[PDB]
GROMACS .gro file of C-alpha atoms in nm:
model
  389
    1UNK     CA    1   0.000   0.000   0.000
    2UNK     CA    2   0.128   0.310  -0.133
    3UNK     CA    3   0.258   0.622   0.109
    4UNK     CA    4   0.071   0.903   0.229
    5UNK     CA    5   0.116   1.262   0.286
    6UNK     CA    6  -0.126   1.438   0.564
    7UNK     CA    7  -0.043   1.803   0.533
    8UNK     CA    8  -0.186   1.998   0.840
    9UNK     CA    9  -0.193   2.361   0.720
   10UNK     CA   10  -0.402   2.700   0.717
   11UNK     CA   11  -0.294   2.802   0.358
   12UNK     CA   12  -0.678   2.820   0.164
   13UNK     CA   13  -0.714   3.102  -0.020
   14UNK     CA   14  -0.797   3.027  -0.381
   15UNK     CA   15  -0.422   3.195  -0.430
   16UNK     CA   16  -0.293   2.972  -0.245
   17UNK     CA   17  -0.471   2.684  -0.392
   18UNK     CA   18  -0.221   2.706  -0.743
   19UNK     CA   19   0.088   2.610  -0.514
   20UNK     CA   20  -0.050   2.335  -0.279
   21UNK     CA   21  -0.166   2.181  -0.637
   22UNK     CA   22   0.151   2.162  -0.784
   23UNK     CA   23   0.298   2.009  -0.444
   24UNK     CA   24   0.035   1.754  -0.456
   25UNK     CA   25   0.071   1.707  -0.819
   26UNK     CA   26   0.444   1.616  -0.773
   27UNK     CA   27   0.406   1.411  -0.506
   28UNK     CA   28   0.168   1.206  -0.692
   29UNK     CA   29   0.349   1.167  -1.015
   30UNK     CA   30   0.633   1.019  -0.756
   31UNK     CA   31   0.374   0.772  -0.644
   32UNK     CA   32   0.256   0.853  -0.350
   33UNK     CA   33  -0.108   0.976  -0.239
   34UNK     CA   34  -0.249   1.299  -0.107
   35UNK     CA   35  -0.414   1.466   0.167
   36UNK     CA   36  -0.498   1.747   0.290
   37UNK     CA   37  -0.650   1.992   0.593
   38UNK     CA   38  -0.733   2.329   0.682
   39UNK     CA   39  -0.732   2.500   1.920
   40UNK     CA   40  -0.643   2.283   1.578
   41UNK     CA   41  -0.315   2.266   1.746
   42UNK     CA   42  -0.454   2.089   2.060
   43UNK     CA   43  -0.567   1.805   1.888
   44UNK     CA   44  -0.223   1.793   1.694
   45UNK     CA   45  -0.049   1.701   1.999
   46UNK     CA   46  -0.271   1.456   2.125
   47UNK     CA   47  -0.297   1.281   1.775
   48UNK     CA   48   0.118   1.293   1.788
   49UNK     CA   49   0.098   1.192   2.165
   50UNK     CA   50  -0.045   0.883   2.064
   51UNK     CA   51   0.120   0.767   1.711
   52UNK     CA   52  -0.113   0.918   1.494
   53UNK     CA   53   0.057   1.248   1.348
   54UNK     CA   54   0.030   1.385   1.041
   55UNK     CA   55   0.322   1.384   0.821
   56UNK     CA   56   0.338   1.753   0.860
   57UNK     CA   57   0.222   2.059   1.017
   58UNK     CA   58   0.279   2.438   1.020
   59UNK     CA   59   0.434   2.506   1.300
   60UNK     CA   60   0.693   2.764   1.333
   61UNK     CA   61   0.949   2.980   1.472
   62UNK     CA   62   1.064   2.910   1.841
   63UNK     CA   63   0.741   2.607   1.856
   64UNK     CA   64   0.965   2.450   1.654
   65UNK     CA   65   1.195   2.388   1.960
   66UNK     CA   66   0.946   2.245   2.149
   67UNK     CA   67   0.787   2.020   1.905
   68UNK     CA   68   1.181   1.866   1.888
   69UNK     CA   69   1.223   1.849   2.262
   70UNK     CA   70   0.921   1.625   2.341
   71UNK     CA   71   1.096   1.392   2.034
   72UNK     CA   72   0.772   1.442   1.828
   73UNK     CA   73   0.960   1.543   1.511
   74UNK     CA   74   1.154   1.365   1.258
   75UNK     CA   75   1.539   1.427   1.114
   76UNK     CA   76   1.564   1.509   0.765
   77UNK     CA   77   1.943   1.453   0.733
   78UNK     CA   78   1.915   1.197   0.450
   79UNK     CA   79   1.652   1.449   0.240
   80UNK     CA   80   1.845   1.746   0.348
   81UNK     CA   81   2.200   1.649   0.177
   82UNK     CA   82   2.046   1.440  -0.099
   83UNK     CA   83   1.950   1.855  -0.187
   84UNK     CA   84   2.217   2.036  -0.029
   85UNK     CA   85   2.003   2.283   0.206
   86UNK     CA   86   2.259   2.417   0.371
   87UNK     CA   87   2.410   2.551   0.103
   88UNK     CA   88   2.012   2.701  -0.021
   89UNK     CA   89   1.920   2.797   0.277
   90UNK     CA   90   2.070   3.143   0.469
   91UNK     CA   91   2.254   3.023   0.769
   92UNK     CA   92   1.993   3.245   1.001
   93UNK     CA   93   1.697   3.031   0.821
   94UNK     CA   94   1.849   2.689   0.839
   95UNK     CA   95   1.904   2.783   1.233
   96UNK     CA   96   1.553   2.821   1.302
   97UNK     CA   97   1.465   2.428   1.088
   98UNK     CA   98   1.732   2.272   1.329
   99UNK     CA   99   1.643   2.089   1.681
  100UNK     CA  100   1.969   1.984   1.849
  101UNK     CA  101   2.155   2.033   1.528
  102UNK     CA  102   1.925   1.819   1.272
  103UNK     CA  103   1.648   1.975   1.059
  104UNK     CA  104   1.308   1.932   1.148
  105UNK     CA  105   1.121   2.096   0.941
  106UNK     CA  106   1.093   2.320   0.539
  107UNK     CA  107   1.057   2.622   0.519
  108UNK     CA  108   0.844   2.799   0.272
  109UNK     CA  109   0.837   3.139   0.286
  110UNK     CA  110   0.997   3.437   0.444
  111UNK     CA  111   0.754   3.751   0.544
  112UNK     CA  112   0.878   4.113   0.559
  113UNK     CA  113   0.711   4.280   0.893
  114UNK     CA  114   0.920   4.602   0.898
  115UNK     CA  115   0.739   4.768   0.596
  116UNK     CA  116   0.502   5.116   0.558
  117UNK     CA  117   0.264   5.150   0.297
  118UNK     CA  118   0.172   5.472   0.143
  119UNK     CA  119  -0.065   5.598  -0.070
  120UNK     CA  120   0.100   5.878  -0.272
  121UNK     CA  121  -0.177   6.041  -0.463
  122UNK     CA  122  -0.304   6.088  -0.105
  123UNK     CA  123   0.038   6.239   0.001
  124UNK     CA  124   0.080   6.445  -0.285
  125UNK     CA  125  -0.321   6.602  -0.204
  126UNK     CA  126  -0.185   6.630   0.141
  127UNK     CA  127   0.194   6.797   0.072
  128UNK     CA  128   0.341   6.519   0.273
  129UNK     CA  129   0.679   6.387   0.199
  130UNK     CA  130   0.729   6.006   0.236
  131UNK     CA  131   0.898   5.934   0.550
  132UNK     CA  132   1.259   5.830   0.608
  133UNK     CA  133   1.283   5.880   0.970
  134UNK     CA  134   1.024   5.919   1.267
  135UNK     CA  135   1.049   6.326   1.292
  136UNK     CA  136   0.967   6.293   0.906
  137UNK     CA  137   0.684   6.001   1.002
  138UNK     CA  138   0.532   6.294   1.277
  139UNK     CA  139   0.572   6.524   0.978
  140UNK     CA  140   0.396   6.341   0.736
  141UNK     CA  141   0.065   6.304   0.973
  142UNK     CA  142   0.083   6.629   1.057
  143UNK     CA  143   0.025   6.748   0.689
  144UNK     CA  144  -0.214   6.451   0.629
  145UNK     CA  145  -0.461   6.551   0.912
  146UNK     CA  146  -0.494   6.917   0.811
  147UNK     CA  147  -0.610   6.791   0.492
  148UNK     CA  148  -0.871   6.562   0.685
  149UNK     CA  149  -0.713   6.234   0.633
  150UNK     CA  150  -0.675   5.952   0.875
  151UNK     CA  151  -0.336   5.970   0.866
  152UNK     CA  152  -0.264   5.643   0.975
  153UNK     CA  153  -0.488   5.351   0.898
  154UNK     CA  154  -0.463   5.094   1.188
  155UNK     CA  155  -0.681   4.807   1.347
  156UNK     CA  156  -0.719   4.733   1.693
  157UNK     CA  157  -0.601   4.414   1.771
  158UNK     CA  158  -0.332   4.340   1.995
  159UNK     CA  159  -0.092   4.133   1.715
  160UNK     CA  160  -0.128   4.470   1.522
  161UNK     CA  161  -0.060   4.667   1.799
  162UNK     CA  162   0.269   4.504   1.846
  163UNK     CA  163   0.316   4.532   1.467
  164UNK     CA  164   0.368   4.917   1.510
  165UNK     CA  165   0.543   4.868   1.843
  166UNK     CA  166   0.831   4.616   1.727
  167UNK     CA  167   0.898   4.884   1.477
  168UNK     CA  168   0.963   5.165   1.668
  169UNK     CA  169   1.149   4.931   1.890
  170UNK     CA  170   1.301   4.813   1.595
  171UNK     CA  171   1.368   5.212   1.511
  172UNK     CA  172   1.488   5.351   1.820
  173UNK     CA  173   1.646   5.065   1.968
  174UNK     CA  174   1.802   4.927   1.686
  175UNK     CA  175   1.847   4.575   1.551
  176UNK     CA  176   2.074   4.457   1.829
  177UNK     CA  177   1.853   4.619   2.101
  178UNK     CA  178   1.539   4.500   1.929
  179UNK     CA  179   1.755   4.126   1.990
  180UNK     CA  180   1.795   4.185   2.357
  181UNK     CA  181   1.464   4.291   2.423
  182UNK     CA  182   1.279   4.059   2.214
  183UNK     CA  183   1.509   3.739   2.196
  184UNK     CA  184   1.709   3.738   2.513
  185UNK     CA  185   1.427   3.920   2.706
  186UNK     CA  186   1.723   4.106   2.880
  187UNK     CA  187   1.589   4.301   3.169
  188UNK     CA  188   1.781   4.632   3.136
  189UNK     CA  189   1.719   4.684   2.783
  190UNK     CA  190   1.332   4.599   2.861
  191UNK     CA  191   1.360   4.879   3.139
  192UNK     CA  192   1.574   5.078   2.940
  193UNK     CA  193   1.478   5.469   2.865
  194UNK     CA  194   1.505   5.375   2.517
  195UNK     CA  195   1.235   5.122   2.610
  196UNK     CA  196   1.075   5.434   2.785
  197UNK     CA  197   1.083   5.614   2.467
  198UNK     CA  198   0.932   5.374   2.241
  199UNK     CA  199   0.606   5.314   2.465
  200UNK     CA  200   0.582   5.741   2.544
  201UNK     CA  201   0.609   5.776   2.082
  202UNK     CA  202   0.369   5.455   2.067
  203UNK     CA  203   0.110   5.684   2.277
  204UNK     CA  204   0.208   5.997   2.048
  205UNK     CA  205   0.168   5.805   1.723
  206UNK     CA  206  -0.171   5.643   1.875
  207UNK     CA  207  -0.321   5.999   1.872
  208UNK     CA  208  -0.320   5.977   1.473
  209UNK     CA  209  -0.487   5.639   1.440
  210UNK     CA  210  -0.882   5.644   1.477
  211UNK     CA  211  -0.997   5.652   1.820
  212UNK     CA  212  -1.314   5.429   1.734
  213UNK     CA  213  -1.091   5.130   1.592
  214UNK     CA  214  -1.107   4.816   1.817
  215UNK     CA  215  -1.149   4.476   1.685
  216UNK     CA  216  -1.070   4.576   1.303
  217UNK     CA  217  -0.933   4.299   1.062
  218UNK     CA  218  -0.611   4.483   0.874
  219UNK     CA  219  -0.755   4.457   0.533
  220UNK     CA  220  -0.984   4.681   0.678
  221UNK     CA  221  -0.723   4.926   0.770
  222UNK     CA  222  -0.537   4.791   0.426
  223UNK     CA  223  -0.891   4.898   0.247
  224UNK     CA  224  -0.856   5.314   0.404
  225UNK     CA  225  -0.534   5.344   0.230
  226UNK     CA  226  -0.665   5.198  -0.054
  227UNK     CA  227  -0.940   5.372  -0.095
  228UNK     CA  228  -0.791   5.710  -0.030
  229UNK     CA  229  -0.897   5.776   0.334
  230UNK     CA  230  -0.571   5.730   0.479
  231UNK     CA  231  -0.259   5.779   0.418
  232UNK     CA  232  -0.008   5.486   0.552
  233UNK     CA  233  -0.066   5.187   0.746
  234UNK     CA  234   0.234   5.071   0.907
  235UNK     CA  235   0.212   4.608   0.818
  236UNK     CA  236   0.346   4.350   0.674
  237UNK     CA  237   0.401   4.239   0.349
  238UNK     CA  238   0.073   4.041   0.327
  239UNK     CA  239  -0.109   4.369   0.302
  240UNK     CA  240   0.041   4.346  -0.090
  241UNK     CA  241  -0.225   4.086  -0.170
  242UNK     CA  242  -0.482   4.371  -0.094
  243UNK     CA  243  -0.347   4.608  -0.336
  244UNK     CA  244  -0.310   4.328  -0.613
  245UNK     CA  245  -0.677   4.199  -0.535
  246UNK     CA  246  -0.848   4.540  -0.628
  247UNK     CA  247  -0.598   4.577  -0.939
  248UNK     CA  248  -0.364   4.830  -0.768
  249UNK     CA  249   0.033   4.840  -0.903
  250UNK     CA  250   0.350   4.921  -0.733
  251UNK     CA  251   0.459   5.271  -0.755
  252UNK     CA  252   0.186   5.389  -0.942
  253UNK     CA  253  -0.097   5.341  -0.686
  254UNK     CA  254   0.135   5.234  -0.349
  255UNK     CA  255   0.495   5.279  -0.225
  256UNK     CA  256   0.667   5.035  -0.001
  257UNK     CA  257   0.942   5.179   0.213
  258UNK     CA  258   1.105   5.068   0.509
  259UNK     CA  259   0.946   5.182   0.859
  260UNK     CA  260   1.151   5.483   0.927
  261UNK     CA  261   1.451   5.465   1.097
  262UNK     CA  262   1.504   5.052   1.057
  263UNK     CA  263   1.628   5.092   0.645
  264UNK     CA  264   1.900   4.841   0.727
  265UNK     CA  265   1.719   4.611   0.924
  266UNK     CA  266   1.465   4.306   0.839
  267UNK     CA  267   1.259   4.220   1.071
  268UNK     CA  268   1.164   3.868   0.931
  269UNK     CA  269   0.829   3.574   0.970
  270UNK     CA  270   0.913   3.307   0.831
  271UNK     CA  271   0.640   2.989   0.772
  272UNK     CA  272   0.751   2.634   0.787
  273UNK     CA  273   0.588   2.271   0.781
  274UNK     CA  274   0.742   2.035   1.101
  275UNK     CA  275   0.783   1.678   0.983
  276UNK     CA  276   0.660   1.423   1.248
  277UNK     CA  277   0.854   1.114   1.358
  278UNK     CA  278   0.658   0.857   1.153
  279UNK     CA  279   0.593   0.456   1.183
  280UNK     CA  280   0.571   0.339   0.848
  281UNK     CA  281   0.783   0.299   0.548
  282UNK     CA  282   0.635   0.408   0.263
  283UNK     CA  283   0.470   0.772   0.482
  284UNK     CA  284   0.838   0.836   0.579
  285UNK     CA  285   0.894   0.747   0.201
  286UNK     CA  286   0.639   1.016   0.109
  287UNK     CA  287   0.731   1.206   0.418
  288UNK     CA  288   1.057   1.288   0.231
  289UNK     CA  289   0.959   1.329  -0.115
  290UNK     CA  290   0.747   1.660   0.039
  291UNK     CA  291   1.000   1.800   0.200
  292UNK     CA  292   1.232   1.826  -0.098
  293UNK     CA  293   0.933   1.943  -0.332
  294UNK     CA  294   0.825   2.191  -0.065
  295UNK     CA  295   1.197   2.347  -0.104
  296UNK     CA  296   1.228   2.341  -0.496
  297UNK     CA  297   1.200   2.615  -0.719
  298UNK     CA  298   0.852   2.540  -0.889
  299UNK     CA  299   0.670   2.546  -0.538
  300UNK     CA  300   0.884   2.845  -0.390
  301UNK     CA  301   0.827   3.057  -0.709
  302UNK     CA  302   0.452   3.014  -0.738
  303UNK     CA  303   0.404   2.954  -0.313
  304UNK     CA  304   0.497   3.329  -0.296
  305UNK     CA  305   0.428   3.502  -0.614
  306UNK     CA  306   0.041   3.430  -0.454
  307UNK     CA  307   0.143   3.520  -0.098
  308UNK     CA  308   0.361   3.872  -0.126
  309UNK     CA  309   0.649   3.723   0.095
  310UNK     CA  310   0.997   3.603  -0.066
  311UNK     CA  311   1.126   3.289  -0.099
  312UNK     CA  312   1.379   3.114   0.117
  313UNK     CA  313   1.605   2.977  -0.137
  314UNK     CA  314   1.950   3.186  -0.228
  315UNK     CA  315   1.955   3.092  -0.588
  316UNK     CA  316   1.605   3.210  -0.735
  317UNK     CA  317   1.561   3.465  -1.027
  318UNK     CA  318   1.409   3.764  -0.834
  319UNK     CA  319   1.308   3.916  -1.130
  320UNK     CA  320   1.036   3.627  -1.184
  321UNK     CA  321   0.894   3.856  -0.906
  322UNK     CA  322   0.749   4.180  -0.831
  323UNK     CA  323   0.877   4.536  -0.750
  324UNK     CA  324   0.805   4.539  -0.391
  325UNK     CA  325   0.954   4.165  -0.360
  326UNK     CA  326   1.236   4.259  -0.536
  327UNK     CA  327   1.317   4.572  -0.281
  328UNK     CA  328   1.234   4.322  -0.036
  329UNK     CA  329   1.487   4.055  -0.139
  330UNK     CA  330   1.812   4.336  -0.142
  331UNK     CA  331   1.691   4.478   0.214
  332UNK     CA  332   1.711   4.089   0.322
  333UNK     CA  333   2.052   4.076   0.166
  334UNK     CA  334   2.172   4.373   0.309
  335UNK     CA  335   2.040   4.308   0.643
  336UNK     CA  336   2.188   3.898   0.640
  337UNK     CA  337   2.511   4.050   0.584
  338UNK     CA  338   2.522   4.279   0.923
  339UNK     CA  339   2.346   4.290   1.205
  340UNK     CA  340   1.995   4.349   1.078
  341UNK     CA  341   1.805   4.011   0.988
  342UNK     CA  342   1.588   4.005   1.304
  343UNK     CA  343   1.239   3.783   1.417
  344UNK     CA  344   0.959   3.917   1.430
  345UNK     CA  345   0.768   3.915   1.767
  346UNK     CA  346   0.466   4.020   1.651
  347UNK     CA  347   0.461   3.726   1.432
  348UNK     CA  348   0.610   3.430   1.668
  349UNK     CA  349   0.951   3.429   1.583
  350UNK     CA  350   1.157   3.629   1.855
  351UNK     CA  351   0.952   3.427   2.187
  352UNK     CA  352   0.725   3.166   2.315
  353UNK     CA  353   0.365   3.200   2.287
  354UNK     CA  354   0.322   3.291   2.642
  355UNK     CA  355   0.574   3.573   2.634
  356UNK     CA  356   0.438   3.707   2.328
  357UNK     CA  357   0.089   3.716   2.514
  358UNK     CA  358   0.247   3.893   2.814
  359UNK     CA  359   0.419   4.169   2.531
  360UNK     CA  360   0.074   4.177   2.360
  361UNK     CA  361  -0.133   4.261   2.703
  362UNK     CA  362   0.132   4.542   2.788
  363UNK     CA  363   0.119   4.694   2.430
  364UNK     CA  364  -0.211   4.687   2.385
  365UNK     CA  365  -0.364   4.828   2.779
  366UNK     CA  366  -0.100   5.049   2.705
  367UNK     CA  367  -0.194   5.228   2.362
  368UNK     CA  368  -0.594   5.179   2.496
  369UNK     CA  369  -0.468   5.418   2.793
  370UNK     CA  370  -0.408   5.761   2.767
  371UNK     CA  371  -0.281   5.782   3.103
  372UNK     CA  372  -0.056   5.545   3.060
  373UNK     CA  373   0.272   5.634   3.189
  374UNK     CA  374   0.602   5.503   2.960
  375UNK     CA  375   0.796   5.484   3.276
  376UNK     CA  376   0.542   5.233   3.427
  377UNK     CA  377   0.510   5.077   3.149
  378UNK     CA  378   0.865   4.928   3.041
  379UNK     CA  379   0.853   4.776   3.444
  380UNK     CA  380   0.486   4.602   3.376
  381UNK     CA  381   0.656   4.482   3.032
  382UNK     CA  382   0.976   4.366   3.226
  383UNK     CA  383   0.738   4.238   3.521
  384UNK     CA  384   0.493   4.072   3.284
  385UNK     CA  385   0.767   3.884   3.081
  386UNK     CA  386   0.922   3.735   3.358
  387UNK     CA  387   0.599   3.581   3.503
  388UNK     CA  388   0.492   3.454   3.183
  389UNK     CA  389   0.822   3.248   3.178
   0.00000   0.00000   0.00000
């Protein structure tokens, strides 16, 4: 009886759809058979607690770690030099698909979080200049809200919220900062005054968002710029799939640029599937064939031409992608060689889950509170983190 893959994944969109088909395609052709799935995580672990995994799973960043610890996972050392993956994959990347020096798991795509969008017919209308640093980011909303624009299109949820905070962390601070604070959770950094000063110019930069904004998706805020309401809205790169969707094109209708003050820096989310420690043959068979396809070129060409992010291999043509991706891909360069290729925390690569809930509360009954005082707040982040650990 022939091998099976079980994919565990959250990847649905119609977009999306093109890429998973060519992975199963593949992995058909090479004889093996297909499936396929869309709190879910829960009943992951007890199906792997008791020998039923799937042969993969998205699962990512530091989970990755854990997943390996508890001996749940698989080693992919005979896949991963049959197709040389060290030598594909940036040493930073490869890190992060390693438990105790084996990997564990593909990745599949690598996000851009440091990015501000801008709408410049809506800058022009305003006399705003686009933004290089934060004095020129104050600027810029300034001139936008005397010519009744939101200036700043953002939701309120807290993952958001720590979206724009990470970035002026990221800005202030500085890449190796961000690191202490975010990675190492080092306490003087985390009660820093630099720390001080990126909570007290969170609660400036709140007072251009829209007071009345709690519980809005980002597409929503992604929609204001679009439709010429706001001006910015400081996001990932997913918010590219936006512009695309209602026939919007780079340069012409929206401008990409680093969040000011981080141009240098990449603050990076990168997806990945774990593969599970498997009992039979012909899965494991199967097992491997996806987790060579998953890291080809067909699959990470089309995976993220339909997703916005960039690809994870080195040796890709970047001009088989588009303008904002291909700013994207240099910035990653640049940042890989220094001291500027940094996870996300927002998006559950710097910390565990429970530390980036603790963040998350701080942020967000933080930027809900007027009051709020940036010298009390850097001790409740401090505080907060340590408990949660």
């Amino acid at each position: 009886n022939p091998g099976t893959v079980d994919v565990l994944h959250w990847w649905t969109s119609g977009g999306e759809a093109k890429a998973v088909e060519t992975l199963k395609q593949q992995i058909q052709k090479d004889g093996f058979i297909w499936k396929d799935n869309a709190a879910a995580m829960t009943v992951l672990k007890t199906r792997a607690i008791s020998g039923n995994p799937p042969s993969a799973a998205q699962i990512k960043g530091p989970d990755i770690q854990e997943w390996g610890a508890l001996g749940l996972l698989t080693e992919l050392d005979d896949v991963a030099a049959a197709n040389k993956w060290d030598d594909l994959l940036p040493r930073q990347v490869a890190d992060i698909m390693k438990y105790d020096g084996h990997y564990v798991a593909v990745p599949v795509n690598i996000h851009r979080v440091n990015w501000l969008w801008i709408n410049p017919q809506v800058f022009d209308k305003a006399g705003a200049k686009v933004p290089t640093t934060l004095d020129e980011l104050f600027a810029a909303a300034d001139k936008l809200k005397a010519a009744g624009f939101i200036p700043l299109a953002h939701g309120g949820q807290p993952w958001q919220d720590s979206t724009v905070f990470e970035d002026l962390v990221l800005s202030i601070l500085g890449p190796k900062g961000y690191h202490a604070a975010f990675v190492d959770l080092d306490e003087k950094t985390l009660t820093g005054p630099q720390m001080t000063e990126a909570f007290a110019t969170l609660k400036r930069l709140g007072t251009y968002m829209d007071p009345n904004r709690a519980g809005r998706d980002w597409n929503i805020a992604a929609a204001e710029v679009i439709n010429g309401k706001a001006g910015m809205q400081i996001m990932g790169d997913w918010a590219k799939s936006e512009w695309s969707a209602a026939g919007k094109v780079a340069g012409k209708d929206y401008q990409c640029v680093a969040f000011p003050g981080t141009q240098g820096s990449f603050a990076y989310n990168i997806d990945s599937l774990a593969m599970f420690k498997l009992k039979d043959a012909n899965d494991i068979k199967a097992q491997n064939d996806l987790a060579k396809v998953a890291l080809e070129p067909e699959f990470q060409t089309v995976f993220n031409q339909n997703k916005g992010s960039l690809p994870v291999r080195q040796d890709m043509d970047m001009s088989k992608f588009d303008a904002c991706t291909q700013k994207s891909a240099a910035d990653f360069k640049e940042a890989a060689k220094g001291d500027g290729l940094q996870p996300s925390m927002a998006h559950n690569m710097a910390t565990t889950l429970a530390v980036q809930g603790a963040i998350f509360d701080v942020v967000t009954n933080f930027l809900n509170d007027p009051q709020a005082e940036p010298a009390t707040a850097v001790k409740q982040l401090n505080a907060a983190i340590k408990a949660a650990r």
